[PDB]
Every structure is written in structure tokens, then in C-alpha cells.
Amino acid sequence: QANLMRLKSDLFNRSPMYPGPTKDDPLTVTLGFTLQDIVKVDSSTNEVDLVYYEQQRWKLNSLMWDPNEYGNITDFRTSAADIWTPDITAYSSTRPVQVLSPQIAVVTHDGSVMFIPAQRLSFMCDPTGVDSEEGVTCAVKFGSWVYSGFEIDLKTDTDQVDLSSYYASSKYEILSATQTRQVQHYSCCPEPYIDVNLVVKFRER
Amino acid sequence: QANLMRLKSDLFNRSPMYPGPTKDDPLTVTLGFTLQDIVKVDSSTNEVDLVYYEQQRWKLNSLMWDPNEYGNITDFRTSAADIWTPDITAYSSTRPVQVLSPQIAVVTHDGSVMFIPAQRLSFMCDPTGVDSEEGVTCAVKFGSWVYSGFEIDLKTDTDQVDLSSYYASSKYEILSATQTRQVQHYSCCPEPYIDVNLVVKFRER
């Protein structure tokens, strides 16, 4: 329909693209994990592979609209290319994250954006003790690679990772999965960097 | 010929591209599988690799035409880039699907679009009991990743997967292969998401 086309053209083509958050105009990105599977555990390189989907949500005054001005339409799906997206990166990654879902996000009239990328991540994790009852605990920090706390802040709706869609017949049973927000200072940089530490405790069944 | 060039121009260059389905203008995608081979089975990571080709069929009033108006031409082939395509994703995938066929679809004057992507998919599947006679059963859900039931609906012409082109000398014999439509409501989302559950029961020779 023409109403969606006009809205899309007015938002993206008519106006310039969002130049990203500043110190003056900061942004708060909400993060959330849905752990689906612990696929592989490589004891010889201390590399662990996870399959999950990341909930990324944020709000821009830039992407707002009056639905009554565009034929009562509240939300729409658009390619992630048309919009600004947060550069949420996994620090301990050992191989590029593989995208497992379409690069499409949902934009709502209040300017709120919802992007749920499905990924396969290979990160640094010593699996020593996965064969025992007590299990093994591993962590990976997700945050903006380039933006400090002054520009992007991170928030989680819950500290508990979504295991509702965790692979039943997986080789590794989840004992605990936590999404904890943390502020960190790095040697290089005086400014702090916010991340969400994904902490998973697991053991083979 | 010039008649098709003009039709292709009047459809794609003259008019703006389809902004995807809405709640107001929904869409129904027909799905279907032709299972060719269960190539690999990784017992150590509970990963199974399938080679198949997926039938994607949908209809747009946008892509309709009077064949008499364009020198009696009923259907034409075009690059999938020129048209909107459904974001049909496999939920339990562990690695990005490899495309094994050209990105070309077929548009018919009634606006119906036919897209048959050939793919190699790696999904979550515990193959324990494949060495037995009873075999092992595994499933994978295919559906739109970003589009709900109110925007995209799924339909199957048959609940039986096409095994007519299944690799005779394959390492794994198909006992049963089913393609059935499902409706799911997830924790995240109030809106339902429609899928087609590919359920294959197999065993080694």
C-alpha cells in the first residue's frame, strides 16, 4: 500500500540518516539473549560455539510519526540497512559471528526500534570440567565496540537469559544463564564502556 | 523481445517497490519441500545437514498485468532482487544456509510469484538411534523471522514432503518426511508466528 510507501519515503529518503548517538544526545540500548544451543566445545583451542538470538531495542525521535497522518499504521518492518543499528560486539569472539536471521527490524510510530539478530558465536571459553556434575562456567561480554558510556548505555529487561527455546536434545545441559550489565574501564581508554556479560554454566547430559 | 522489456519496466521501474505485507494488506506464502539428501550427521554436536529445494509461492496485486496489453505473455523469469521475497527462516539452524540455486523467480500475470531456492541447511538434531532399524526423528521449523501471522500466513499444498528426488545411494534412508503448518506464540511477543514443521524420520543403510 501507498501509505506505507509514503511513510518509508518521508522517514528515510526525505530526512538525512541518524548520525548515531553523541555525548549531548545519548542513547540507551536494551539487550536480551535467547540461548538456543551450545553446539560445539573445542577443548584443544578453548573455543565454544553458541546459537542464540539477540534482542536489541532502542528509540529515536527521528523515526517517530503520527499514525493518523499515514493511514493508521503503528509499526512496520524494514531492512536494517535503511536504519542506524547499534554496533553491539562480543569481546572474547575468536571467529566472526555468523548471521542466522534476516537483517530486518520493526519500527514503531514512537520511534522505537526492535532488531532480533540470530547468531552463531565462537568465543574464548575453557570447557575443563564440562564432563563433571558441577559443570563449567563461561562468559562473553557484549557491548558497543566504538561507543563509550557517554554515548551508548545498555540495559536488560531481565538478568535471566531466555532458555525457553533452548535445544532439548543438546549435548550440553544449561545449569544457569545470566545477562548481567557491567561498566568497564580498559587500559587504552579513560572513558568507560558498557557491556552485558552473558554468563552460562553448563555440563554434558 | 521489447514487449517483456516494457512489461518489466512498467512493473519495476515505473512503480515503487512493494513495502512488504501489513496488518491491513496481509499475505499468504505457500511452502513446500523436496528433500534431496541427508548429507552428514554430526553425533558430537547434534547437527544434521540437509540438501533440499524449498517452494515459495505468493501473489501480489502489484505484479498483475493484462497479457493482451503486453503481447500475450503469461509469465516471466526475473532476479529475486527485482521483487519482494518472504524472509522464510529455519528456527533450529546452526550455520547460515548455503544457496545451491540461482536467485531467480517466476512472475505470472495474476501477480503470483514462484521462487524455488535450493539450500544446504545445518540444524539442531540429535541423531542418537540412526544406527538402529527404528531410526531417528528430527524436526526444523520454517517461517518468517520478522513477520507475524497478521502480516504473513503460511500454507502447504500437501503435508507430505517430496521424496521423488531423494538421493538413492544416500548414507541415510528416509522413513517419513512431513511438512505441516503450525501456529506459535512466543514469550517475547503477543502476536503469533506461523511456521511449517519439516519432520524427517531416517536411519543409515
Add this chain to the structure above:
Amino acid sequence: QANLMRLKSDLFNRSPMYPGPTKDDPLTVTLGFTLQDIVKVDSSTNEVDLVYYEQQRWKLNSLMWDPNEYGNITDFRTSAADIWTPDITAYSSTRPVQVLSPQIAVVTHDGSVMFIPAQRLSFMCDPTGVDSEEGVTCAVKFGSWVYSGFEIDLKTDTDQVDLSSYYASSKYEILSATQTRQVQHYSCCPEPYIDVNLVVKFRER
């Protein structure tokens, strides 16, 4: 020189690109294989890897010219992107074909195009009996994925595959290599699909 530049301009920039074959304007693609190696045989997944270069040659009235008008020039090399190319796909492929040669084709004044892509293909093949004197026979169908016989037809100049450039110190010795045209009907489709059957009989040296 300017004569070729002008010809290239008058053919590709001045005129719109070929919309592909139709039922009304069909096309006949000539195919040919030069088998270079049987690199890998995977007994555990019944996957065989071939390296070859495929001769694709077709003619378009679209790409014709009077060499006198363009400073006596019979032919020219151009990127495969500048022209329409047939969507010749291997049916039993298990992994995407890897391109091993530049995407350049030769165009002649009579509109005839010659395209020789070098590829590495992984296809379905049970190698049981390769360790024997009698050897093992495997086949792979090459044809247009999206076009029926009414649109594209296939032809071979010879039924004998070119083994003149077959890797001498290969782990597998070729007993016979045949390229044969065939017409087939698929369960899905009422229209027939033409392919060239590559049939190779081989054994380890």
C-alpha cells in the same frame, strides 16, 4: 581503441539488457565439460569433488553487429556482468560451486557468446567400489534451474567429455566420461526440463 569502446557503448549502454529467453523467443545453450580432476571422494557422506571448466555458448540477435561499421572487429572480451548468462545449475550439488576462473566471456559479431567458467563442484556420489579394478560410476545433471525446455534448450557438440587436461597424477583414473543431453519431467512441474548428464566412471590408480 575508440572503435571497440563505441561498440561496447552502443551494445550495452544504448540498448536495454536482454530480458532472458521466452516461450516465443527460445534459446539453445551448447554445453561442454573439460574434466581436470576428481580431487576428493568422501565415502562417509557420499560426496565427490570435481574440478572442471564448462563451455557455455549461445547466440543473441541483440549482440549482433556489422564489423565494417565498427572498424573491422569480429569479436571482443567483456565481463559476464555486462551480458545475460544462462542459469546452468548442477542438480545433485551438495555445496555451492566455487568459481576458479574470471567472469569474462567472448562476444562475436554474429551475436554468439562463449563463456568458459572454471568450477569446483561437490555433488552426490556413492564411491563404493572405487578401490576396485571395475571402478565406480557417478553422475550429475547440469541444466537451467528456472527455465523449462520451452524457454531454454541444451545441446552438446560431442557426447565425450574432454579429458585432454585431466590431472595426470590424480588419485583417481578416469575410465569413461560422458556428457549427454536428456529431457526430464519432475513431480512438481508439468513442463519438461533439459539437462546434460555428466557421467564419470573412475577408480583409484
Add this chain to the structure above:
Amino acid sequence: QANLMRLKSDLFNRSPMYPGPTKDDPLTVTLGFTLQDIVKVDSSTNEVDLVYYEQQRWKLNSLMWDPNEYGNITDFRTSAADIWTPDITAYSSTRPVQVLSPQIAVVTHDGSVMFIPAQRLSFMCDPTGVDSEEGVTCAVKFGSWVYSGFEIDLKTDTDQVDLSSYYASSKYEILSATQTRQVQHYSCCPEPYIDVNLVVKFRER
């Protein structure tokens, strides 16, 4: 905000892109490594895999601005595509470097650019003696592939590689890690070529 959008426009859209350093206008790139993990060691091919992030730092008079002219904004983040980036290549690489971080850099009003690419590098390294107490030493040269000393000079803020973010539970312990500027002369070329030699001495736990 509009102030940054206008700045981004006046810098990138208004002016043509930087054609790279010349002999007349040379450039000095500061380099630095933060070694995160020695992932794999392949004794059979003398290939070693490192996970690290390289600090790239240069200044352009081209990218300078008066912050008081653009609503008091000192620095901003932009995609590496919008700007010129140094062609810092690892000489002994055996496989293409895998990018593990977003392609975003930070531009400051004095025209200074900070680019921190996270990478997985596979380079030539004989690990013979890694199983000993003394360990094994390996090196890799990083420098501009195409630009000489009179176009791109290299500098390090410190000769000590940043091990503050080195993977604690890694399979290989670090015994020493140093970033050292060196001038190379090649047979081919009249101008010398500058690099930073990354020298790491390590052993298994």
C-alpha cells in the same frame, strides 16, 4: 542532531574523498596491538592463529573543524567507508584476516582518526618448542602494502604489546610480546617500506 548531520555533510559530501598520502603530503600512522589469545598452533603447517585488536591512528587536515562552528562537538563516530583508511597488511599472513569488530572509526576536530579493528590473523610461525619451559618466539610484520616511507610512516606509542586483555584460560601463556618499528628495503622499490614487527614469545600452560 542536525549539527552533527551538517558537519558529516560538509566534511564528506561537500568535499571530495582523500586520494591517499602523497610524497608532497605524507602521513604517519600510529600502530598498536592488544593481544587477546593464541587460539590455535598448527605444527603440521607452521601456522599460528592470533586474536587481537590493532590500534590504527592518523590525522588529516582534510577532516579538521571548528567545534564552535558546529555546536561544540569535539569528536564523532563514522563508518570506515566514509573515510580513507591505511592499508596496514600483515606480510607473513597465510589466510585472509577475519574481521571481528565493526568498521567504525572516531574522527576528532583536529582531524585525528582512531580505528581499532579486531582481527583473527593466521601467520607463518614454527611452533617447535612450545611444549618446553623456554617457549617459542614468532614474529609478523605489519605495514602499508602499497605506500612507502615517504607516503606512510609508522610509529608506536610503546614497544610493549598490550597484554592486559590477554585470555587468562588460553592454551598458550605469554612470555613476551613487542611492537617494534622497522625500515625494510625491497629489491623492486627505491623507497624504503616501514612496518611494525609484532614479536611474541609463548608456551603451552
Add this chain to the structure above:
Amino acid sequence: QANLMRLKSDLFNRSPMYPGPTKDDPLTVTLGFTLQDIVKVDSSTNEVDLVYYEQQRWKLNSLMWDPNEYGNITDFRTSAADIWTPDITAYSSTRPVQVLSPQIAVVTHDGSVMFIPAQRLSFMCDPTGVDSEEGVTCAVKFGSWVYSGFEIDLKTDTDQVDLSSYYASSKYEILSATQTRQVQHYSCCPEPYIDVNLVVKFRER
């Protein structure tokens, strides 16, 4: 500076791109190899992996300029995309060459282009006897895939491959490495094709 920007504009934007060599206007490409390593040797598939960088040197009247007309500038670096590059291909390759260096070339005022791509090549080679003192000899032909001798000629400045940057602690010691120009006739084609046979004799240390 504006002097180079203007030169780059007057060369690439103001004039059409070079349509490649013809029979009427032939070209001579100089080739050179700098062998860095024999990384892997696969005895089971008779595949050998080489790491090297190839000298590609050619002169075009098209790319010439008066340096006194463009603010005394002799040479400049540009992306290989901006210019025509020879389609030098390795005949016995078994997997696509991996690019290990930036796609930048150097253009001199006399119209001479220098392009030094660093590559990892996997080619057909029986390594039987590498464990011996005598070693094993292997060869790979490099030449234009689509252009005959009438179009492109190849030349080497020396028949001795550059081993000055050969990995000292490599698993395989080079006994001899030769780059020799060869003319061959192929079954397919009446016209001859010029190659540069890279011939390496090596053994494990």
C-alpha cells in the same frame, strides 16, 4: 591535494575505461613471483598450498600524463577497481585463490601500472617423495584465462622466482623455484595461450 584529485578525475571520470587488449592493439604483461611459503601439502588429494605475491606490470597509453601539467607528480596509488587488470589465472587451481593483500595498484605518468596481489593458491601437485633428500617437483601455469597470445603476451624479468622473502622456518625447504614463459595450444582453441610455468622443487627440512 587537488592536483592528484584532478589527475585521477581527468584519467578515470573524463575518459571511458580501457576495453582490454585486442588482436589490433595487443598488450604485454610482465609477471613475477615472490614465493613466501609452501604452507600445506595434502598427500591424500595431491593438493599443495602456496603463499606468495605476484608482480603484474603493464603500460597503457591511456594512463599517461605530463607531470608538469598536474603539479609535478610522477606516480600515484589507486584501487584496482578504477583500472583494467589482467585476468592472470592459475590453470591447475583446485580452490579459489585467497587474496592476502589490498586491491591497490601504482600508476606512473608513462602509463605503466604495477599491481602486486598477495595470494594463497591451492593447486594440483603429487607430493610423493617430499620426505626424501632429492625432494619433489611441482608446477602451476599462470596465464590469462580469456585472452590469446594475439591479445596478451606474458614476459618475466627473470626465470628465477624471488625466494628473498621465503619463510625460513617453513616445513618445506625450496630446492629450486623457476618462472618460465611458455606457449601452449589447447584442444578447444586454434589460437595459442601464453602462460608462466611456476616450477618449484622442494622437500621437508
